[PDB]
C-alpha cells in the first residue's frame, strides 16, 4: 500500500524486515535475470508484472522461479521490487558467475608412486586392464581386484555435474545412463555423447566408472553408472563461458536427485553466495545424496568459494607424490573445509574422441587397444572423482548411510601421511578405499542438521542475512547466512565443540562512491548502516544430536532528539512511520531537545514530522539519532504548503518513487 498524508495513516503492527536481495558485485553476476525464492508462488506474479519479465524456469521442488528481465538490469529490477511490500517471497538474487575448476594436461610419468611406495613388485597394479600399470591413483587409494569382489559400486548412480560426457567412448560402454542438459530441458539418452562443454566430464566419468573389460583403464567404482548433468554447455549456444546459470544448475541437481543419483561430483565454483544453490545442495542432501566438491583451483583466483563452501559437502584436495611422500599438489586451495585429499596429478583417463563434441586433444602414445582416446590430467578436478568413486563403492556396502556418515568414514580412515592428523591443505589425509570399506559406518561424529536461528529481542521475527561462523582450533569450520526466517542451516556437519560467531544484518548496500566519494544506498540490503549490525559469540558451544539448534536474540537501542524550534507550527508531532508509508507506529507531541527512546521498537522504521496546518515557509528540522550508542545527525525539510516531512541522515530521502515510496529506514531489534 501507499500513502499521501501522514496524519491520515492508520496504526499498524511491526512488518518484520526488508525483502532479502542477493548482494550485487560488479562482474560477479549474470545480467538480465533474477532468481526468486518464494513461499507463495502467487506473489511471484507481482514481481513478474513489476519488472514485466518472463518466467523461464520453474523449480517447485525448492520454490524457485527464474525471471528473464527483457531490457532491464538486475539493479533496475531490484528498484522495481524493493518497494512492493511483498510478503510471501523468500529472496531475490541474480545467478552468479561460476567457472569450471579446469584440469591441465601433463606428461606420463613411469616413476609415479613407485620405488618403496606401497607394494610396487609382483603385480603391484593388477586391475586386469591393459593400462593398469599407469593407474597409480587406484593403487594409492587401496583399490584391488579382491576389494571389488566385495563392493564395486553396483546399482549406485553417480551424477557427473560438469561439461557432459562422451558416452560413445568404448571404455564407457554400458556405463553412462540417461542424463540431463538443463539449459534446454533436454533428456540425454544413455550411451550418447553429451560432451558439449569440453573434455573434463568424460575424464571424470572414466576415473569414477570406466568399464572393467581388460581394455583401456578402469574406474574406482566399475560397478556404478554415470548420470551426466550438463552445467558447462557450448558457449556458442548459452553464451559466456558456457556456464548454464545457478538456476539451471539447481534444476539439474534437482533432476539428478529425483532420478536416483546417490552421489554427485562437482568441480566448479564462484564467489557468489547463492540462496538458490544452497537450497539445491540441501535438497539433494536431505534426499540422502552425497555431494563431493573439489577444493579451489588456486590463490590468484580467490573464487570457487561456492558450492565448496556450503556446509555438508565433502571438499577434496589434490595430492601429488614425489620424493617418497604424498603432498598437496600446490594449486589445491588451502581451506579448513577440506575433508580429504586424493590422487590429482598424472591421472590417466578417458577423453572424448577426435570427432566427438567435446574433443580437446588426447595423448596418442597411450597403448590402448580399444580405439579409445585418453589423456593425463592434473588438478583438484582429477582428485574429486577418486573420492566420488570411493563414495559409490561405500554406498553399495552401507546402503543406509547418511551423508555425514560417509564423510566421517572417509575422514576417520584417511592415511595421515603428514603425521599431524589434520591440516588445512589435505584435511585428514589421503582417502583410503580399503580402510573405509572395512568400516564399520560411524554412529557418532556428525549430525543430520544443526541450525542457528537469529531473531529480534522478543523472538517474533527472524533476522535475514546474518552471518554465522562456526569456528574451532582444528577440524573444518562452517559458514552460512540466515535466510528470510532468520535460520542458517548446517546439514551433515561434524558434532563437537565450536566457537560460534553471529554478525548483524549484512550492510553491503554502501552509500559511498567506490572511487572514494559520497553516494547513497540503493535500499537493497537489510540494514543500511554499520551501526545497525549486532554481534554475538558463543564460545565452546557443543553441537550433537542432543543440541541441534542455537537460538540467538538480537537487541538494540535507539534514541532520537530534535533541536529545531517549531513553535511557529500548529501542533507539531514526531511520528514513527513505516518506510513504505503503509501506516504509523505512533505519534507524539514534538518537544525541542526532548530525547525520545525508541529502544523498545523492533523492525524497520522511518521518522517524520506532521503539523495540523501547512507550513508558511520552508523549515529545516534537525536532530540527532543515537543508534546502538552512535550519534548520527539527521535532518529534513518541511516544505511550505505541506503538513508533513521525513527526517533522516540523508535529509528525508525516498529511495523509491512518489507512487511506490520507500524511505530510508532504521533497522532495530527491540529489547
* Cβ proximity of 634 and 647 under 8 Å: yes
Q: By CB under 5 A, what part of segment 491-530 binds Ca ion?
A: none
* Cβ proximity of 558 and 527 under 8 Å: no
Least Å distance, CB 209 to Ca ion, is: 10
Distance CA(365)–CA(515), nearest Å, equals 55
* Cβ proximity of 502 and 466 under 8 Å: yes
Q: Of the candidates 130, 200, 121, 132, which has an alpha carbon nearest to the alpha carbon of residue 160?
A: 200
For Ca ion, which is the closer residue by CB, 80 or 211? 211
Distance CA(436)–CA(440), nearest Å, equals 8
The set of cell numbers assigned to 496 is 563437537
Least Å distance, CB 383 to Ca ion, is: 21
Distance CA(293)–CA(214), nearest Å, equals 30
**Should residue 279 be labelled a site residue for Ca ion when binding is judged by CB under 5 A?**
no
Least Å distance, CB 350 to Ca ion, is: 9
Q: Which residue is nearest to Ca ion (CB)?
A: 216
For Ca ion, which is the closer residue by CB, 30 or 350? 350
x/- binding map, residues 197-226, to Ca ion, per CB under 5 A?
Answer: --------------x-x-xx-x--------
Rounded to the nearest 10 degrees, how much is the dihedral formed by the CA atoms of 468, 474, 475, 476? 30
For Ca ion, which is the closer residue by CB, 133 or 460? 133
For Ca ion, which is the closer residue by CB, 171 or 532? 171
Q: How many amino acids of this chain bind Ca ion (CB under 5 A)?
A: 7
> Which range, of 165-173, 388-396, 545-553, 646-654, touches Ca ion by CB under 5 A?
165-173
Would you give the end-to-end CA distance of the chain in angstroms?
A: 29
Least Å distance, CB 446 to Ca ion, is: 36
H-helix or E-strand spanning residue 238: helix 235-238
For Ca ion, which is the closer residue by CB, 222 or 483? 222
> Which range, of 55-63, 128-136, 234-242, 295-303, touches Ca ion by CB under 5 A?
128-136
Alpha helices in 415-510 (DSSP H): 433-438
Residue 338's φ and ψ, nearest 5 degrees, are -65, 125
For Ca ion, which is the closer residue by CB, 8 or 369? 369
Least Å distance, CB 372 to Ca ion, is: 9
Distance CA(590)–CA(2), nearest Å, equals 25
Alpha helices in 244-335 (DSSP H): 246-258, 275-286
For Ca ion, which is the closer residue by CB, 79 or 171? 171
Least Å distance, CB 226 to Ca ion, is: 14
Q: By CB under 5 A, what part of segment 418-437 binds Ca ion?
A: none
> Cell numbers 528481465 correspond to what residue?
69
For Ca ion, which is the closer residue by CB, 171 or 234? 171
**Should residue 169 be labelled a site residue for Ca ion when binding is judged by CB under 5 A?**
no
> Which range, of 164-172, 352-360, 430-438, 491-499, touches Ca ion by CB under 5 A?
164-172
Least Å distance, CB 135 to Ca ion, is: 10
Report in angstroms the alpha-carbon separations of 307 from 61, 90, 151, 189, 275. 19, 20, 29, 28, 11
What is the b/e burial string over 355-384, where b = at least 16 CB atoms within 10 angstroms of the residue's CB?
ebbbbbebeeebebebebbbbbbbbbbbbb
**Should residue 129 be labelled a site residue for Ca ion when binding is judged by CB under 5 A?**
yes
Least Å distance, CB 210 to Ca ion, is: 5
Least Å distance, CB 536 to Ca ion, is: 56
* Cβ proximity of 205 and 176 under 8 Å: yes
Least Å distance, CB 173 to Ca ion, is: 9
For Ca ion, which is the closer residue by CB, 278 or 362? 362
Distance CA(339)–CA(386), nearest Å, equals 13
> Which range, of 11-19, 73-81, 104-112, 127-135, touches Ca ion by CB under 5 A?
127-135
Name the site residues for Ca ion (rule: CB under 5 A): 129, 171, 211, 213, 215-216, 218
Amino acid at each position: 500500500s501507499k500513502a499521501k498524508d501522514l496524519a491520515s495513516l492508520p496504526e499498524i503492527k511491526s512488518q518484520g524486515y526488508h525483502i532479502l536481495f542477493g548482494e550485487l558485485r560488479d562482474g560477479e553476476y549474470t545480467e538480465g535475470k533474477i532468481l526468486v525464492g518464494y513461499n507463495d508462488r502467487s506473489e511471484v506474479d507481482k514481481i513478474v508484472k513489476a519488472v514485466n519479465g518472463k518466467v523461464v524456469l520453474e523449480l517447485p521442488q525448492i520454490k524457485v522461479v527464474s525471471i528473464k528481465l527483457n531490457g532491464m538490469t538486475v539493479k533496475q529490477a531490484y528498484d522495481k521490487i524493493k518497494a512492493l511490500a511483498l510478503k510471501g517471497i523468500r529472496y531475490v538474487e541474480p545467478s552468479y558467475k561460476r567457472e569450471l575448476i579446469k584440469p591441465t594436461v601433463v606428461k606420463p610419468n613411469p616413476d609415479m608412486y613407485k620405488i618403496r611406495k606401497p607394494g610396487l613388485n609382483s603385480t603391484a597394479r593388477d586391475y586386469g586392464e591393459e593400462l593398469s600399470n599407469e593407474l597409480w591413483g587406484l593403487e594409492a587409494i587401496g583399490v584391488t581386484q579382491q576389494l571389488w569382489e566385495e563392493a564395486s559400486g553396483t546399482n549406485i548412480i553417480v551424477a557427473v555435474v560438469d561439461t557432459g560426457v562422451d558416452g560413445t567412448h568404448p571404455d564407457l560402454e554400458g556405463q553412462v545412463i540417461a542424463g540431463y542438459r538443463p539449459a534446454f530441458d533436454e533428456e540425454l539418452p544413455a550411451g550418447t555423447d553429451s560432451s558439449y562443454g569440453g573434455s573434463a566430464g568424460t575424464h571424470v566419468a572414466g576415473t569414477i566408472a570406466a568399464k572393467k573389460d581388460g581394455k583401456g583403464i578402469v574406474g574406482v567404482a566399475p560397478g556404478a553408472k554415470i548420470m551426466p548433468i550438463v552445467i558447462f554447455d557450448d558457449p556458442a549456444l548459452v553464451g559466456g563461458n558456457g556456464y548454464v546459470g545457478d538456476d539451471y544448475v539447481a534444476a539439474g541437481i534437482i533432476w539428478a536427485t529425483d532420478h536416483g543419483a546417490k552421489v554427485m561430483n562437482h568441480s566448479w565454483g564462484g564467489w557468489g553466495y547463492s540462496y538458490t544453490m544452497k537450497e539445491a545442495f540441501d535438497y539433494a542432501m536431505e534426499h540422502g545424496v552425497v555431494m563431493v566438491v573439489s577444493a579451489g583451483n588456486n590463490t590468484s583466483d580467490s573464487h570457487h568459494q561456492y558450492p565448496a563452501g556450503y556446509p555438508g559437502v565433502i571438499q577434496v584436495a589434490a595430492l601429488d607424490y614425489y620424493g617418497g611422500t604424498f603432498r598437496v599438489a600446490g594449486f589445491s586451495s588451502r581451506s579448513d573445509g577440506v575433508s580429504v585429499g586424493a590422487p590429482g596429478v598424472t591421472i590417466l583417463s578417458t577423453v572424448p574422441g577426435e570427432d566427438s563434441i567435446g574433443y580437446e586433444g588426447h595423448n596418442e602414445n597411450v597403448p590402448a587397444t580399444n580405439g579409445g582416446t585418453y589423456d593425463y590430467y592434473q588438478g583438484t578436478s582429477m582428485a574429486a572423482p577418486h573420492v566420488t568413486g570411493v563414495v559409490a563403492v561405500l554406498l553399495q556396502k552401507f546402503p543406509n548411510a547418511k551423508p555425514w556418515q560417509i564423510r566421517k568414514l572417509l575422514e576417520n580412515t584417511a592415511f595421515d601421511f603428514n603425521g599431524n592428523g589434520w591440516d588445512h591443505d589435505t584435511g585428514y589425509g589421503l582417502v583410503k578405499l580399503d580402510a573405509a570399506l572395512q568400516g564399520p559406518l560411524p554412529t557418532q561424529g556428525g549430525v543430520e542438521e544443526f541450525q542457528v536461528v537469529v531473531t529480534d529481542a522478543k523472538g517474533n521475527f527472524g533476522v535475514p542475512t546474518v552471518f554465522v561462523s562456526m569456528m574451532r582450533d582444528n577440524g573444518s569450520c562452517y559458514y552460512a547466512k540466515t535466510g528470510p526466517d532468520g535460520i542458517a542451516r548446517f546439514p551433515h556437519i561434524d558434532s563437537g565443540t565450536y566457537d560460534i560467531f553471529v554478525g548483524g544484518p549484512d550492510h553491503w548496500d554502501r552509500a559511498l562512491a567506490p572511487y572514494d566519494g559520497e553516494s547513497i544506498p540503493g535500499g537493497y540490503a537489510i540494514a543500511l548502516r554499520m551501526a545497525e549490525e549486532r554481534q554475538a559469540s558463543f564460545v565452546g558451544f557443543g553441537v550433537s544430536p542432543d543440541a541441534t539448534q542455537l537460538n540467538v536474540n538480537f537487541n538494540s537501542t535507539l534514541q532520537v532528539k530534535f533541536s529545531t524550534n517549531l513553535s511557529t507550527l500548529k501542533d507539531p508531532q514526531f511520528v514513527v512511520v513505516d518506510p513504505l508509508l503503509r501506516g504509523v507506529y505512533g505519534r507524539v507531541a514534538y518537544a525541542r531537545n526532548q530525547t525520545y527512546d525508541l529502544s523498545l521498537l523492533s523492525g524497520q522504521i522511518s521518522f517524520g514530522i506532521q503539523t495540523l496546518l501547512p507550513a508558511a515557509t520552508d523549515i529545516t528540522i534537525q536532530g540527532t539519532v543515537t543508534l546502538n550508542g552512535e550519534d548520527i545527525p539527521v535532518y529534513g525539510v518541511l516544505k511550505a504548503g505541506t503538513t508533513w516531512t521525513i527526517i533522516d541522515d540523508f535529509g528525508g530521502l525516498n529511495l523509491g518513487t512518489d507512487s511506490q515510496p520507500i524511505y530510508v529506514w532504521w533497522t532495530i531489534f527491540g529489547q
